[PDB]
Design a protein around this ligand. Structure first.
Ligand SMILES: *[C@@H]1O[C@H](CO)[C@@H](O[C@@H]2O[C@H](CO)[C@@H](O)[C@H](O)[C@H]2NC(C)=O)[C@H](O)[C@H]1NC(C)=O
Ligand SMILES: *[C@@H]1O[C@H](CO)[C@@H](O[C@@H]2O[C@H](CO)[C@@H](O)[C@H](O)[C@H]2NC(C)=O)[C@H](O)[C@H]1NC(C)=O
Ligand SMILES: *[C@@H]1O[C@H](CO)[C@@H](O[C@@H]2O[C@H](CO)[C@@H](O)[C@H](O)[C@H]2NC(C)=O)[C@H](O)[C@H]1NC(C)=O
Ligand SMILES: *[C@@H]1O[C@H](CO)[C@@H](O[C@@H]2O[C@H](CO)[C@@H](O)[C@H](O)[C@H]2NC(C)=O)[C@H](O)[C@H]1NC(C)=O
Ligand SMILES: *[C@@H]1O[C@H](CO)[C@@H](O[C@@H]2O[C@H](CO)[C@@H](O)[C@H](O)[C@H]2NC(C)=O)[C@H](O)[C@H]1NC(C)=O
Ligand SMILES: *[C@@H]1O[C@H](CO)[C@@H](O[C@@H]2O[C@H](CO)[C@@H](O)[C@H](O)[C@H]2NC(C)=O)[C@H](O)[C@H]1NC(C)=O
Lengths: 197, 252, 197, 197, 252, 252
């Protein structure tokens, strides 16, 4: 069934995410897919660059960018606070659904497993991984991923939080001003215990 | 309802309107380096009396960097006071220890997590090379290759190369300083011999002898009806000259 | 459905695992989640330290600890032999179920894919991965994972085996006596072919 | 249900794959498992060596081998073009099913997410990972994995493509002529957006 | 229907039959280093007239390696023309620069992806050690430790060690070459003095003097009824000998 | 049913009771470094005659470490016999080869998998520095910088510095040993000349000459009615002294 997936869709025509502070409007395409897998959620996440400034991050040595995702009590995306400006919905072929979201709270990371402001359980709120950047010379550049589930709230509305940080610190930059085209990260898959329906 | 209230810990979401209608809601969020703690509200609604309902930034708490343990034979001093966002950590090593790494670390924020600029520095033991070799003189611990903190060496001139001996100019004992450099400059072993001081219409009163070397003190007294022009006390300097110059007794 | 998951639950009040030989009673909390994904099993595993001795492993340079899991012919956990002292059950919100386990043999690693005592197929019985430890200075410490499926039996009762080994060999220890608090490993997800229902 | 899986089966008696150009007949056993997970596919892939020449690749320093998988418009494997010479089918215990394949197009990588010959979207067609080789001295040897989804077509029949490349470039070879036995890679799991049913 | 047609870009799938029946289908696939572009067909069916239907390899396009940007103070020259599969890339550094890395890179195919053999080379600045020390002579920039490209040094002999001065043999000015070696061999500072040239039945016409050093030119003219045996012009060489040898005037 | 039986390969699960009831079951498991092979039972039930049913540890088999291939120009010797758990592997290099790495490897168990302590060592070729330079003497292969195993050098003294030549004390030929050190100490080239041996009431019988050098043998015979006090045979030592000392013929 299509109700087991909560996604952004496949390659949206326009940019749906404002990933960096310096940007005034939407800078990139955030491809996020949340699939219900028993008591866990298969989280599939990657970015496709749109703006000139975001694509030019491949010309720098030390770079870090975070995709902030905030959700309310019912498990609905808070677009005004989150990096993603388009709300998530069910599978409709290769696009998002139009109607109501069946058990949005079910796709949310558990507060029991990933608590808020509990310093004695801080370590449990973190997930680390690696994705790759296909450079102009067709070689893979490794990018570090820092995932924070819940832990920090920004206001009275934020009941569920997901933070994904892509970063790299190397001696040589992935690309140069003449070789750089589009900043595209390889799909990263992480696992977390889901909140009840 | 006019412009919404401004807070030090929380910032307004969206552009503020010059005028608001009755029932309009405005939301706030904790600033960069601040986190929310329940149950206090971070939003306000305009009441029937055209005013904003009571709201405070007391729910937003400051994000802090991890506790830096004092480095071995050194110290970590928070220049701004705490571990709060936007503050720095200064490092000073103890007496006889030098810093290896970053002297200053800044409290940064990377993906809503407070993290320091880098790894804390190490305070390594101060070691210095042998003292300078002087002509016509030798120092203690001559065969020692490496010297540690406060290790002192005493200089002494070679035996007399004839009727006049070698004079030691400056401090004889020098030690290894905090900046891996010797405390004072190496002394000189030079043959210092001053000329016989003779004052016309004046008599010598102190420091009697036929030969005068380094730091030799001689005093003079003028005869009846004669005034002293200069200083009565004269000391032989390092360059074999009387400092102040030899006085003269002038007639009244 | 809840029957597709076989787990330990979410953050049990008391320690449910005796991971090390030196311990007399339960030393840590083993969070194990087995989700049926077609012909495969999504195995989600991580540890939360309880005892002082287990939390103090972060002060050492060379450390290795194994979580032994033994199962009978019907696919039920043998608590007296296994490191985990509490039997696994279905999803009941954020806790374990009380009743019967539906097709326990289905969550077990296949004997056809992962044989017992077959030296000419030894290489097939191994799975390797990496998890991370969130240190006191908020940096991630990588920990090597060695997973052995079936291969070795301890007695006539052990029909299905799962062995998870967390290890590290570095020049500098993750923490010191004053910085060390709780040994928590990041969630590790591995895949294996499941035995028939 | 068994229809959610499209696999090669578990350890086939005879070699079902001709992975290298130098081989005249089938050289190894390709274990491929494709499980439908919402809008994604859980792809489980590893190789078990059969021929003497393929098992002897462990004696060399610089080695690279690709498993080419080609599919038609309906999502059926083209055995005459692909490295795998036996067609994929549903789960039947620990073996493949005999009958018709329910929605074969559903297991295929999406042309919308992974396009063909689109140079401005080239970076999106790549997936990178790591598997391990259990050496004779019982140490794990890391092997780089390069996965290309769709991107390149070979003829008018190839509508869906999956290319898996196992490679290593080290100073010391994994094994020697006397220590080498069988080339077995650890199971690798990758994720991709699936085409519509 | 006889053997199926052969193409340069696409190859037949399976072994070809010597004879085919009416309706039989044969399929082709793009060769190694070639990719398919729709909609043109890559298969043919034998028609009722026992011939193969029209088919072309126009759908198969050549696989190309990534564009190599010219190295700083050097150039990337495609020896075979393009970036196509099976071609190579040659690297040549500019005047006063040497190559570090691989001079040649080959366009390879690894997992249906066109990739170069390795990373492109770097053209580093040419630097050379001081020029050779010569006996009885000195050069300019004597205290300079490291010399860069085109840096020239002029050699000059020491003052006269008596009545005859030191003669300079060869080029005085030498520069740092492209191969990190000095352009020419270091000159010689040797005392060159030739014997007084005297020709029987002949008179000297040019280069008058009592002493003859390096490169000294002397001309001779024979007396009445005498022919010259050799060359009239004689030059003193580096080994203090007349080259060509001293002429002789023989009687007619 | 009393205490359950004890086995060398398998251990009892849980604390043993001093007394058991009829029907009570006790289970065993293979010890650390042992694995189970079916179908033999690893459990026993107490029968009606208050005794335990027959059970054996024959199902538990010893865990073994991987086979270590003999290192090039060396050998791997299992000190305890096999590759079993708790055993060690010793490494000895062949004649003219030295060990690099761990001499001893222990069979360990990490996550129920038998693995060795580390990587096996390498036996590198034995090479030694030039032999010691001796005063008044020279050796063969004087310009050779590096010497390999069994390479021998012969020492020879310089020509006579007057009427007496240089004497060679010790072995002339020395070779490169197994411990990268020269087999024997370098010989001495010293002028060895002994005093003329004269015995009162005794006559010389062998080794006639005017000069006596190193290792010179002289024999003595006493006259009629005289006994020898010491040894008849005397040899000149390295320190120009007769060893044993010059004999004396004493009257009877
Ligand atoms: C508008 O303002 C009036 C005047 O202050 C508020 O009425 C007062 O409310 C307080 C608190 O309950 C009482 O102690 C006074 O007796 C009230 N005075 C009068 C004159 O009414 C009123 O509550 C406000 N209304 C709204 C809707 O916010
Ligand atoms: C925190 O303290 C630091 C150090 O005292 C302040 O930085 C100094 O600021 C003064 C005035 O601008 C300058 O003259 C110095 O050069 C600075 N020194 C260093 C080491 O940065 C800083 O402004 C304080 N910041 C806050 C937010 O309290
Ligand atoms: C077999 O060959 C014949 C002869 O060339 C083909 O018939 C010709 O087809 C062309 C094209 O339509 C026409 O212009 C001519 O008028 C035809 N000539 C005759 C004599 O029939 C025919 O199409 C071929 N048949 C098949 C089945 O391929
Ligand atoms: C591409 O060009 C290269 C370089 O010109 C060719 O390689 C040369 O081939 C000739 C003739 O066989 C040899 O004499 C040279 O030694 C080769 N040089 C190098 C550097 O390889 C090559 O054959 C050409 N290949 C194609 C496919 O066009
Ligand atoms: C208890 O012990 C008795 C005595 O040994 C067992 O009976 C014997 O069993 C053997 C084996 O079947 C026969 O050969 C003998 O004829 C039996 N002798 C007698 C006197 O009965 C008996 O089987 C045991 N019972 C249990 C329940 O273990
Ligand atoms: C295996 O053999 C080793 C080596 O012979 C034994 O270790 C020696 O034990 C003796 C007696 O305790 C000591 O004196 C030596 O110092 C030991 N040598 C080394 C190199 O360890 C060992 O005890 C034997 N172990 C078993 C289980 O058979």
């Amino acid at each position: 069934d299509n109700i087991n997936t909560l996604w952004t869709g496949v390659n949206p025509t326009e940019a749906n995410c404002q990933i960096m502070n310096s940007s005034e409007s939407n800078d990139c395409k955030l491809i996020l897919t949340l699939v219900k897998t028993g008591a866990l959620v298969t989280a599939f996440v990657y970015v496709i660059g749109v703006s000139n400034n975001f694509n030019m991050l491949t010309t720098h040595r030390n770079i870090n960018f975070t995709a902030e995702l905030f959700f309310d009590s019912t498990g609905n995306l808070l677009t005004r606070l989150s990096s993603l400006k388009t709300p998530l919905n069910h599978k409709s072929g290769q696009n998002m659904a139009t109607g109501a979201i069946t058990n949005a709270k079910g796709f949310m990371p558990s507060t029991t497993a990933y608590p808020f402001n509990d310093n004695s359980r801080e370590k449990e709120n973190y997930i680390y991984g690696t994705c790759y950047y296909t450079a102009s010379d067709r070689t893979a550049f490794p990018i570090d991923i820092s995932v924070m589930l819940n832990r920090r709230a920004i206001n009275d509305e934020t009941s569920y939080c997901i933070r994904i940080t892509w970063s790299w610190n190397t001696g040589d930059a992935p690309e140069v001003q003449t070789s750089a085209t589009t900043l595209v990260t390889s799909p990263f898959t992480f696992y977390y215990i889901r909140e009840d329906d | 309802c006019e412009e919404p209230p401004t807070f030090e810990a929380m910032e307004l979401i969206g552009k503020p309107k010059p005028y608001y209608e009755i029932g309009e809601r405005v939301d706030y969020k904790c600033k960069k380096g601040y986190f929310y703690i329940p149950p206090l509200a971070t939003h306000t609604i305009c009441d029937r009396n055209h005013t904003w309902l009571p709201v405070s930034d007391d729910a937003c708490y400051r994000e802090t960097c991890p506790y830096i343990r004092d480095p071995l034979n050194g110290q970590a001093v928070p220049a701004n006071g705490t571990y709060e966002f936007g503050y720095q950590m200064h490092f000073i090593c103890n007496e006889g220890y030098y810093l290896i790494g970053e002297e200053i670390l800044y409290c940064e924020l990377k993906g809503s997590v407070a993290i320091w600029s880098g790894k804390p520095p190490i305070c390594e033991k101060v070691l210095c090379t042998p003292p300078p070799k002087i002509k016509n003189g030798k120092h203690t611990f001559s065969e020692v290759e490496v010297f540690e903190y406060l290790d002192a060496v005493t200089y002494s001139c070679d035996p007399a190369p004839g009727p006049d001996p070698f004079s030691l100019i400056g401090e004889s004992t020098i030690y290894c300083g905090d900046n891996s450099v010797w405390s004072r400059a190496a002394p000189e072993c030079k043959v210092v011999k001053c000329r016989f001081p003779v004052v016309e219409n004046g008599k010598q009163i102190s420091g009697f002898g036929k030969k005068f070397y380094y730091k030799a003190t001689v005093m003079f007294e003028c005869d009846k009806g004669f005034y002293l022009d200069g200083s009565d006390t004269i000391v032989c300097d390092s360059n074999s000259t009387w400092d102040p110059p030899v006085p003269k007794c002038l007639k009244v």
